Amino acid sequence: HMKLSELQSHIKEFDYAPEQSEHYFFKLIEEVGELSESIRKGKSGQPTLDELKGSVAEELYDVLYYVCALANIHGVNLEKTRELKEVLNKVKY
């Protein structure tokens, strides 16, 4: 099972255009829109390959893709961000 840092870095291999940061933010919003549709239509559950198009699962995945792509573009390590949040959570507490 893939690590989040591995997903980020695979994405960075084939989809990383630092001169076009805005692209990735536009894409995030597009996928959030597609997600909204898929939830509106109740396309829940875990699809098979054939059921994947337009499913909530696919759209959640596409949002995730752009979260990772934006992290690459903006010099963010998500796993390291989590650790720092843990530090803050522990003082809270």
Binding site per annotation, positions for Mg(2+)? 31, 34, 59, 62
Among 12, 15, 54, 76, binds a copy of itself (CB under 8 A): 76
State the first-to-last Cα distance of the chain, in angstroms, to the nearest integer. Answer: 32
Sites for Mg ion among residues 41-60 (CB under 5 A): 59
The only residue of 7, 34, 70, 78 in contact with Mg ion, by rule CB under 5 A = 34
Structure tokens at 40: 């509106």
Place of tokens 């573009």: 73
Within a 10 A sphere around the Cβ of 32, how many other Cβ atoms?
A: 13
54 binds a copy of itself (CB under 8 A): no
Q: Which of 29, 54, 92, 93 binds a copy of itself (CB under 8 A)?
A: 29
Q: Are 38 and 55 in contact (CB under 8 A)?
A: yes
Token reading at 29? 């919003």
The verdict on 34 binding a copy of itself (CB under 8 A) reads yes
Q: Does 36 bind a copy of itself (CB under 8 A)?
A: yes
